[PDB]
Design a protein around this ligand. Structure first.
Ligand SMILES: Cc1cccc(C)c1OCC(=O)N[C@@H](Cc1ccccc1)[C@H](O)C(=O)N1CSC(C)(C)[C@H]1C(=O)N[C@H]1c2ccccc2C[C@H]1O
Lengths: 99, 99
């Protein structure tokens, strides 16, 4: 699809068999989702945003669908204000900025 | 142009007679620039994201140029770690997400 930016670019994602809302976020290097269960081992990561830094859990090779497009990649879990789909997964689904 | 997301989508902007590098950020409602002087009145504002909130000064009706595209809109000035072009200016240059 072509998504304009007059409103927040909110989309539906599927992760762990569940539907969630997330923001397509070109300013995010990585993808961050609110507290939830994911399988496997995790490693620590720090990420810095407009207000400072937060600690998150990094899960690798996670199955995720973004507006029906299938991706498999890294997903961070932590106290993010909103679920964010960052460049690591935007590149997987072939998303570009255009003007 | 068409801008891929393998790297951070950084562009050169002209604002207040100055050249700055900034991030094309679909996750930001508004545009925020590191400390600089801008003409006219301003109002204080709090903006929030990962890691919480920062206080900025809101300047309205500020002219900017991004890759040959002039626009006008609100610009926030404050202690942002990265200069960010948000949706309020991205719309005006006709920027979209496509996949
Ligand atoms: C995930 C990650 C991993 C590794 C490295 C980096 C840089 C990562 O990205 C971190 C990040 O937070 N990224 C931010 C942008 C960013 C990058 C670097 C430093 C600081 C911030 C993300 O894109 C984003 O905007 N966001 C994120 S939360 C949000 C959707 C509310 C939005 C935001 O702040 N929006 C608020 C905002 C921002 C600017 C102006 C106005 C407003 C109002 C509100 O809408």
């Amino acid at each position: 699809p072509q998504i304009t930016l007059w409103k927040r670019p909110l989309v539906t994602i599927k992760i762990g068999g569940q539907l969630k809302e997330a923001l397509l976020d070109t300013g995010a290097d990585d993808t961050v989702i609110e507290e939830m269960s994911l399988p496997g081992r995790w490693k620590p990561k720090m990420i810095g945003g407009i207000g400072g830094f937060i600690k998150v859990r990094q899960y690798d090779q996670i199955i995720i669908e973004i507006c029906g497009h299938k991706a498999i990649g890294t997903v961070l879990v932590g106290p993010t204000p909103v679920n964010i789909i960052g460049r690591n997964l935007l590149t997987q689904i072939g998303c570009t900025l255009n003007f």
